[PDB]
Amino acid sequence: LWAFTGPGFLMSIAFLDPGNIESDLQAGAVAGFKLLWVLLWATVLGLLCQRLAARLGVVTGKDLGEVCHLYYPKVPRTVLWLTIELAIVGSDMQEVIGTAIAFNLLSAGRIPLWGGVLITIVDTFFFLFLDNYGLRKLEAFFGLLITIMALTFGYEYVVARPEQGALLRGLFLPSCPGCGHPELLQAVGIVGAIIMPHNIYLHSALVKSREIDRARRADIREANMYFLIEATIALSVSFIINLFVMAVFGQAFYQKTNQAAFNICANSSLHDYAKIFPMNNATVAVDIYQGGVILGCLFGPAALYIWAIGLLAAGQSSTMTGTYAGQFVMEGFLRLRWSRFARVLLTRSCAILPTVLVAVFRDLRDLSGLNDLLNVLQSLLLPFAVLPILTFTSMPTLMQEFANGLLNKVVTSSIMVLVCAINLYFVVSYLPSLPHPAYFGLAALLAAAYLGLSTYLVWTCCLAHGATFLAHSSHHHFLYGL
């Protein structure tokens, strides 16, 4: 019967991390049905990236990790693995921040911000205690949880009655009406959170698991096509869900004042989450807790709880996704297979200490600013995963027949230059807030190292495709290949 009735949705329900909810709600509060075009373009852009990743994993037979280990010296291998691990621990930081904010939400502030931290450590204990074939059952249960929250949440979206013309125009037309610095920050966070560096690696690794006959190129072609349909189904589902979430939050939060929210929640059933808001009539600083509060205010008392459990399930799925990706990237780059327990413990700890410090000495708004900064960090770390994949899918020696057509190379050059332009704009927008002489120091040195690794990657990819009539004799193994 249907050979696609079930496959495809699984990858999406793992593409929908809590970050695509938090950055979503920040963008929806900062602007209405405006940044949706950024969402659509990012979804298409990640569709292209996942197509490239599946291509590489299918035809080559290796993953990004194995090819990177094979085709790099020790220093760039190590620094690239460090950046990938930084991306994974940043995703885990976003997950723990979301879970902690949700847990602070549940008890009406009785549990402290590090109470959520302790429950995440309990979750890691649960993972290590299970570590069995029944883990897939728990993953299915949590996937059903996020699925049901998404379904009831789409019901709430259609209840919200979004103005059709406004969000249709915002989606199909890329205008930026009255945009400024915070909306720039939210757009960059969206483009860096909808798609993430470690998804490409993990997708390639999972693609490698599929056995390929290799006798004829036909089986490779059909496998690549089927995986492309899988990826496009997942991306379309993710984009639809994020469109629903962005539209509803922008409808409920665009030109919303503290007095307005207090007045609506004073008229509703809910009370403690009615009195949370202050009385200032100014613009509202918006985080996950207030988003859940207004959700429960408008769409019913159970909305708070369902949003909370959905966020928790998304965080758990993202945690499993991250530990899988981390195990694969270490096994590839550094050629060591650690148990899943080692990965989850390492990533969870390396995420938990900074979040513990910030939560214990700062407030909720600082947490939201911090995890927005993690989304932007994922944006800045995108190139370190988007150049190697193009380098290895355009390389004539691992794959001869299924190389890259000139249209694909030029559009990938466009992706790289565009992402570089957005990152450069963000850096020039954010750096001026360092008003101390000689303070540039370590941060500037790290930025210089970032640019040096970027230049190294640019040189490598230029060797991969071009280098004709202009190349250096040293490090000539790239063009010939191994």
SS3 (DSSP) at 316: helix
From first CA to last CA, the distance across the chain in angstroms is 43
Bridge partner list, 283: 257
Q: Choose the binding region for Mn ion from 12-20, 156-164, 243-251, 292-300 (rule: CB under 5 A).
A: 12-20
- The count of other CB atoms within 10 Å of the CB of residue 281 is 10
Of the pair 375, 394, the CB lying nearest Mn ion is at: 375
The span of 20-28, 67-75, 311-319, 441-449 binding Mn ion (CB under 5 A) equals: 20-28
Q: Decide whether 12 or 412 has the Cβ nearer to Mn ion.
A: 12
- Which CB atom, from 193 or from 220, has the smaller least distance to Mn ion? 193
Give min distance, CB of 330 to Mn ion, in A.
Answer: 22
Stretch of residues binding Mn ion (CB under 5 A), selected from 19-27, 158-166, 175-183, 367-375: 19-27
Closest distance to Mn ion from the beta carbon of 380 (Å): 16
How many residues bind Mn ion (CB under 5 A)? The answer is: 2
Q: Which of the stretches 3-11, 17-25, 156-164, 227-235 binds Mn ion when contact is defined by CB under 5 A?
A: 17-25
Nearest CB to Mn ion, comparing residues 71 and 244: 244
Give the whole-angstrom CA distance, residue 445 versus residue 457.
Answer: 18
Closer residue to Mn ion, CB minimum distance, 20 or 124: 20
Q: Which tokens sit at 38?
A: 């950024």
Distance (Å, rounded) from C-alpha 227 to C-alpha 221?
Answer: 10
20 binds Mn ion (CB under 5 A): yes
Nearest distance, CB of residue 152 and Mn ion, angstroms: 21
* Two structure tokens written together for 338: 């650690």
Residue 340: CB minimum distance to Mn ion, A: 22
> CB 373 → Mn ion: shortest distance, Å?
16
> CB-wise, 17 or 156, nearer to Mn ion?
17
Per-residue contact string for residues 456-475; x = within reach of Mn ion by CB under 5 A: --------------------
Identify which of residues 27 and 304 has a Cβ nearer to Mn ion in the complex: 27
Q: Which of 22, 411, 34 is nearest to 193 (CA)?
A: 22
Considering only the stretches 15-23, 130-138, 222-230, 473-481, report the one whose residues sit in contact with Mn ion under the rule CB under 5 A: 15-23
Phi–psi pair at 16, nearest 5 degrees: -95, 70
Q: Under the criterion CB under 5 A, does residue 321 sit at the interface with Mn ion?
A: no
Contact 176, 183 (CB under 8 A): yes
- Closest to 54 measured CA to CA, from 193, 235, 216, 215: 235
- For Mn ion, give the closer residue by CB, 238 or 394: 238
Contact at 8 Å (CB) between 88 and 198?
Answer: yes
How distant is the alpha carbon of residue 420 from its chain centre?
18
Convert residues 323-352 into a mask of x (bound to Mn ion by CB under 5 A) and - (unbound): ------------------------------
Helix, strand, or coil (residue 257): strand
**Neighbour count for residue 143 (Cβ, 10 Å):** 19
Q: Least distance from C-beta 46 to Mn ion, angstroms?
A: 8
Nearer to Mn ion, 17 or 95 (CB): 17
Residue 160 tokens, joined: 């919200």
Residue 335: helix, strand or coil by DSSP? coil
3-state secondary structure of 394: coil
CA distance linking residue 232 with residue 15, whole number of Å: 12
Minimum distance from CB of 17 to Mn ion (Å)? 5
Q: Are 18 and 318 in contact (CB under 8 A)?
A: yes
* Residue 391 touches Mn ion, criterion: CB under 5 A: no
Neighbouring CB atoms inside 10 A of 480's CB total 8
Interacting span for Mn ion (CB under 5 A) from 14-22, 62-70, 341-349, 410-418: 14-22
Nearer to Mn ion, 17 or 372 (CB): 17
Which residues would be at the binding site for Mn ion (CB under 5 A)? Answer: 17, 20
